[PDB]
Structure formats: structure tokens, C-alpha cells
Ligand binder design. Sequence first.
Ligand SMILES: CN[C@@H]1CCc2c(ccc(O)c2O)[C@H]1O
Length: 281
Amino acid sequence: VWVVGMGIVMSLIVLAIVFGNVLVITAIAKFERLQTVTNYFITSLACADLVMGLAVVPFGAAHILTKTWTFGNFWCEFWTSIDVLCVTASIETLCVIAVDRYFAITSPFKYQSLLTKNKARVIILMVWIVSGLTSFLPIQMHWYRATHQEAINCYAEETCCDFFTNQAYAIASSIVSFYVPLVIMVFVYSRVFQEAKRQLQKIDKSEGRHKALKTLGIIMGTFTLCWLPFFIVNIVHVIQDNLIRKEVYILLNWIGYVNSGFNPLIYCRSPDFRIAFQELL
Ligand SMILES: CN[C@@H]1CCc2c(ccc(O)c2O)[C@H]1O
């Protein structure tokens, strides 16, 4: 009496995720003043989020509400590979943006020489290649498959799709996709905040006659709150099988996806972007 009609809540996520990234891409591409070395990371992240909005969410919604995977097994493997690829690419692009901000702030004179039109292409291509080798190579080769009887029963039957993964693959994927970027971004942002505080003290020293905390809080909190809860259960549920149920795992995984829709609000607030949005509509 309430399961069927509540498809609007899942459809709104798809609509918002598509719309935000579409506007970001259109604003960057069509408008002359928005093209900058930093903006290429933004457009790569926007494309990665658009792939999630167009591929993984619509099929997952059907698989959940219908409780039956109508399609075959090849599409199941392909969809899982797409999911892993997009997630890791998005997180590593966030890490790349953070490191670029660190270089921009800490070394003002020599920022120009390090990043240019040439280096952005190479770094983006290497990030996407690293993301691709994590997902497609182990999943498609069938090297990640489990061993217990339940996994065999699930993988033999075509109509059932569930994620059963070996301990080593889970640990390796979690480490390569989440923790290293988290440590890098934490160190970078702490250093940047310390620099900002030092500059504020320096100016107050002579001009005698908050904002950084708020910005850092938003940037760190949205990412950590959206995804950290997932990888914790991802690592725990393989070490000891009795603890974590499947429903909790699914809920945390779907909570992680919503972070894709919040990226345009977090990373696109410049007055130039506002002018571009106003001109489009
Ligand atoms: C079913 N969805 C997948 C399952 C496991 C997994 C995800 C994302 C990144 C990873 O490194 C993973 O191992 C999830 O999005």
C-alpha cells in the first residue's frame, strides 16, 4: 500500500543528478570565460557523475523494487564493473582537485610552471586508467569470485544478482579507492588551513585600527559523511560474516551514491558560474 507509489523518491535522485551535471558541462563547454586549467578536473568529475546518473542508479532501482534481475548475467557483470569504475574515478578526481589547490596556495610563484595545458590531459588520462584497471580487469576476468556454497548458488542462477567478494579483493579495492585519497586530502587541507590562519594573523598585525573554517567544514564533512560509513562495513563484513546484514549494506551503498548530486553545489559557486547559469536559462 506504500511500496509501489514511492518510486518518485528514487526518480528525483536520477533527475537531479542528471540535471546538475548537464548544466555544469554545458556552462563549461559553451561559454568562453569558464575554460581554465582547474576546470578540466571539474568536467572530468561531472562526466564521471553523469555516467553514474545514467547507468547504475536506474538499473539498481529496478533490481530493488522488482526484486528480480530480468536481464542476464553478462549485463550484471558489466553493470558492476561500471559501478566500481565510476565510484573510484570520482573519488580520485576529488583527490586530484585537492592536490591542485594545495599547489596553488602553498607555492604562488611556481604554480604556473607545474600545471599547464599539457599536464592536465596526462593526469586525467592516468587517473581514468587507474580507475579502469581497478574495476574491469578483476571483475570481468572473474578473478574476484568467492568460494562458499551460497556464492556458487547465487552465481549459477541467472535471475539472482548479489555481490559476493573475496576478502583480499575487498581489502585491496577499499584501500586503493578510499583511504589513500582520504589521507592525502586531510593532510592537504590541514596545511592550507594553517597557511590561511597565518596570513590572517599577519594582516591583523598591521591593520589594527571563520570563513575558512566554514568552507573546510562543508568540503570535508559532505564527503566523509556521505562515503566513510560504507567502506567501514565493506571491510568489516568480510572479516566476520555474522555481523552485518545485507539490507544495511545496501542502504549505506545507496547513501554513498547521493554524494554525486551534491558535487555541483559544493564545487560550482563562483560568480562567473552564476552568470553563466543565468545566461543559459
Ligand atoms: C554493489 N556496489 C558496489 C559493491 C562494492 C564496491 C563499490 C564501490 C567501490 C568499491 O571498491 C567496491 O568494492 C560499490 O559501489
